[PDB]
């Protein structure tokens, strides 16, 4: 189970290498959102994307 | 099948207790190593005597051999 999970994660990372970020969106609240092939979150910043 | 071969040897071993002259009649009557059941007269022909004497030898030798002192161990060959 652990080996398959790790291999699947590595394969996903390999796929995501080509063109990680598509574009960006600006909210009316001045916030910014970045769209890409993967979800990346900062562990030490309350997981703000 | 060793018991069959051993049984054959025991026949000679038991007959060893009998005299050669009287042992020969038993061999001829029961056809030892030849198989032919020689009749009382034929044992007479090969021995050179009358036939009733062969019956007498058969009876005496048969009574001798039936004693436990001679047929001690042959009972193991029941069938």
């Amino acid at each position: 189970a652990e080996v398959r999970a790790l291999a699947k994660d590595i394969a996903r990372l390999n796929v995501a290498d080509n063109g990680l970020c598509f574009g960006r969106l600006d909210t009316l609240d001045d916030a910014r959102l970045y769209i890409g092939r993967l979800g990346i979150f900062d562990r030490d910043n309350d997981f703000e994307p | 099948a060793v018991s069959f071969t051993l049984l054959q040897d025991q026949l000679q071993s038991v007959l060893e207790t009998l005299s050669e002259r009287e042992a020969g009649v038993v061999r001829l009557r029961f056809g030892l190593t030849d198989g032919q059941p020689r009749t009382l007269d034929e044992i007479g022909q090969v021995y050179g005597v009358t036939r009733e004497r062969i019956r007498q030898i058969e009876s005496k030798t048969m009574s001798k051999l039936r004693h436990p002192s001679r047929s001690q161990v042959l009972r193991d060959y029941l069938d």
């Binding site: 189970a1 309350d46 997981f47 | -």
Partner: protein, 146 residues
Amino acid sequence: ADVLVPPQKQEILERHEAEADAIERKYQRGALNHTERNESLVKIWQDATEEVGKALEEFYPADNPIITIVKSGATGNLTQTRTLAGMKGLVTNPKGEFIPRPIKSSFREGLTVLEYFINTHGARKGLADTALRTADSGYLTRRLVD
């Protein structure tokens, strides 16, 4: 008396529960998908299990029988010791996928009803897995012998 439980288990477990709650909050806001949330929770709890195992290894005295049996190489491994004393950790579904919520209890403390029930899945799976594992090995061995 010899099955010592580390005194840092509580702090580690709440510290990682806070991050699991952060993951849940972000999922509720719509920044995560179901599978991605499950994967993040699995990562967090694997880290928690790793730190609990390290703390347990550090705490045990060098002459304690439970860890002396392992460190000498005579029998067992530290994962079994952690499961016995530290915490069971994560368990798999019947499909073979990790359940996001781990078994925070240790067999010294005694698993609860639901934790035990979810734990039985892997135990039942292993019985068939071991039997099926021999077929491929026999196939390759026959090829090699031929």
